């Protein structure tokens, strides 16, 4: 058992979305406990919870109302369960599962009636309302607020009004929502406005603070007649149907790969700076942060990645557009959560050319070569034995080692998601199973220093990589091998 303890990867499960009503009311404690002690009984290490922006300071600038939620971590403190605390600073309602409609503080929706470009924006015009564009970071417009100082005072807000939680250990990790679905990219792919996988997606910089920054840059590169994309096609669009994605298209001409290599800084920059102010927010505090990047499987199969890149993701077969993130992630001992951890090639239609176990394979692999924790999440609901074993499998892609902690093992996996059908008879002893082999057939261990998950006080970011540096991480490397199969699966 002692061997077998330090392959332990813990097992959290994703609270159903407006646990916490819009109004900010903790509508149903009694029967969420009765599923919480069933996933305490189960061996379920802990929960993990959208903290919506949209609801705590819904009622103005620093307004926060923190009381709901209160009561929701008293509660899964009593349930004897851990929290990861997600800052959501995005709206729920127009992505795959959302069903509840959560948008962003009515006040900022106000400031954005009269500037449409604080949301992100397609070619076409489109102002999508579920995020602030990384465009207005650091503008001060929000009543001589940026976007980020809304985010690092909410931050601290949560901090010091939940002090007793976290000096408890209640809260193990502080997912810092970066985007679309808290996720650290661009809304290229809103079901909002029609798309439907497998679509190549849209490019999202059109909203006047990044078009003018993306001229900026061009003009600075010696090319300052330069334009965004104007050969990308649109959302369902396949890559050959565009001049930008087919075989020798833009993307790979000089104004391309400029424009590619821009783009997606705007999303290392964006992370690193707010992450510098959860490391702030959070200091000292018994707590790990971490990040959630999508997974963008579909197109991974062709040599222009077309969807990770209308994402954010300037990810291609010969340029690695993850392992930056980890670096970045890095001087803020973060974690690195992403998706997918579910899903098998052979479940995606064939023309989608998507490749989800090798995007996973590639995305973990960066991280663990970059020294830091590696986590992640189904990308959709799944009860089957056969999405357990593929997330068991990606948990320890090299199986278990008698011997004592395996090479290589994530971090934690959270469930998507607390529902009524999960804890339905079979469903849940399958879960049951799951549960187990992720705990390497150990029992449920409380005390997380037994399996080397020690929580101790977040430490400073330590000092800024230039984005040279982060770019060296760009340099393709052999992922580390996988198992066809893990060697814990939850029946035979
Ligand atoms: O409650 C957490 C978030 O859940 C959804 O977003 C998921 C998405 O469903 C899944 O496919 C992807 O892999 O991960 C994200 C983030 O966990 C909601 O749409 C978000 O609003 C929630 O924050
Ligand atoms: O809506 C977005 C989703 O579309 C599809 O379901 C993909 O399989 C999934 O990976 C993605 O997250």
Redesign the pocket.
Known sequence: DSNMLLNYVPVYV?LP?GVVNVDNVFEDPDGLKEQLLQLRAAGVDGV???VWWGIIELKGPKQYDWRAYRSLLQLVQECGLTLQA?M?F???GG????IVNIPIPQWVLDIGESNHDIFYTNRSGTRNKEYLTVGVDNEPIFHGRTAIEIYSDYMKSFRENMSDFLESGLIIDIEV?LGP???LRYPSYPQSQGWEFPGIGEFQCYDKYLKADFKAAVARAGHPEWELPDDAGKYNDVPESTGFFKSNGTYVTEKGKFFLTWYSNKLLNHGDQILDEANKAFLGCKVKLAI?V??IHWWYKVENHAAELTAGYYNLNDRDGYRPIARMLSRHHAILNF??LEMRDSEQPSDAKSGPQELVQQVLSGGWREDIRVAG????PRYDATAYNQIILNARPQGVNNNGPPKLSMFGV?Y??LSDDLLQKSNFNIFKKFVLKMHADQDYCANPQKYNHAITPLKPSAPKIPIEVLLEATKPTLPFPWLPETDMKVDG
């Open positions: 994703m979305l993990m919870v959208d997600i959501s995005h709206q729920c992505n795959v599962g959302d929502g679905a808290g996720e959630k999508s997974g998706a997918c999440e189904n990308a959709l959270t998507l998601r």
